[PDB]
Amino acid sequence: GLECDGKVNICCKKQFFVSFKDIGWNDWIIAPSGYHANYCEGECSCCVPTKLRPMSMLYYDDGQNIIKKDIQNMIVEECGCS
Amino acid sequence: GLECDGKVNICCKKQFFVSFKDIGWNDWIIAPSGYHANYCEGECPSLKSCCVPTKLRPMSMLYYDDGQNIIKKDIQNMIVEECGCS
């Protein structure tokens, strides 16, 4: 489990968090507050995600429709070389 | 999700089941009966694609570590359920 911090070059995960307020999505997305956009970059074999975590969202599909969904492999928790 | 069946060249999973009895491991491995040795082989067009497992399932084992020690463990990413290109 490697964590990219600036100048490292090996296959690790970057970690930038996105809040739906700054995006203009906090009106149709009821919950959660934000998405953990963690991605894998670097050079090895392909630097693929190795540990994935499902995520549940609560959102407006329409003016009168609420959706509760559970997405698999939504959040990349840990990656390394393949 | 692609399933390798004999003649095929795209990135899919081949699956053969291994019973610990046929291996000589059914004495220290109490449970389960066998392991699902599913692995990903195949070819993806070329930033390259490695045909990596995409859906993984944890598995728990019950086994003798010693003559008087029993272990119940839960391993992550033990079984490869589905793969695709990366």
Next chain:
Amino acid sequence: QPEMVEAVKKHILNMLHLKKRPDVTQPVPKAALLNAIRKLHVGKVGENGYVEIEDDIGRRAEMNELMEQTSEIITFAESGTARKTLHFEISKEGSDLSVVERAEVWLFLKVPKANRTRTKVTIRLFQQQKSELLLSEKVVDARKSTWHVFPVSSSIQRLLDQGKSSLDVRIACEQCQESGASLVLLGEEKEQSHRPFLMLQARQ
């Protein structure tokens, strides 16, 4: 054959943090083993047979992938063009879902004064086509203002089978008024919290 059998062997050993398969010894008596794992609830054994792991984490993952395929839809009623009627425009997400596991209509019955008299009223829901079929017939409690759930899984199923996504519901409750009760079919201000809604839960 052998090169692969040895390949998964080493893999199993790496996952268990073992450099090697355990050396062969004489294990504890089987009766001793089975009894211990039973009492600790780590393993099940039945009818003089093999052992199955209780609290299998693989059975948990097999469950988490099930609810990943099951989606919940909350469809709020829109005011119909007719008396005592609700319009439901089910989200287009309902097209991706084939099998209805559960479908409920939620109505709020408002009862200002708690009656000890006339506790029972019959509420009927009518789906309108072209003709009205009975969605649900339910005798409910008229003691106090409370919610009431109407099972319509079969109807919503049949509706999705026919490729339709719209439901028009007429509601009937003759005994409601004399009980001092009224079903909320609209968002009265300060009563908008009681706006009726359809719940749909479907998979695949």
Next chain:
Amino acid sequence: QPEMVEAVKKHILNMLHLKKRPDVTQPVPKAALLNAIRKLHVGKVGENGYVEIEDDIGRRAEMNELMEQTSEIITFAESGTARKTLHFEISKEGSDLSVVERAEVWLFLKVPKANRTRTKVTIRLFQQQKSELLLSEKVVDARKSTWHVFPVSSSIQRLLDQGKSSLDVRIACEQCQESGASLVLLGEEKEQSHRPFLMLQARQ
């Protein structure tokens, strides 16, 4: 910055099977919304506005990875060289484990005749060092043959901290015999099913 914000935007939309972000409209009243999700147990609401998803599948995955860190060890007693003493050789797997969550010693008290008299007996467990420290002092039921659990988490914790992997236990029960009861310390024929054992559950 923007090219990346748009990257996750498209990503989220592909997971939801949406070609596009929903068009802006007028949503249902919040009181209507919050009340509905509360009653269906799909969401929790905190006063002043905050919304948390009830039955978050992310919490389940966070739970599954937790029990992946935790291992259970069942260590069977080996017969000591002294009277009324058990020897425990904890698996080397216990070295990988640093924090003890739970540790139990299991003893079977055999009572052939069900007595209404002399119901209470005091059982003591002594860890032997160099000196004997009290593992557990428990008053138990002597009505009928049954198992009895002794909590020793603190001691097993202390033991693993000291880098040790061995436990020698002396057992004392003076009132046992006059109760017509006896603790099984060695697995007799057909009584091997009652062989005493230590349970260790630790993580990280």
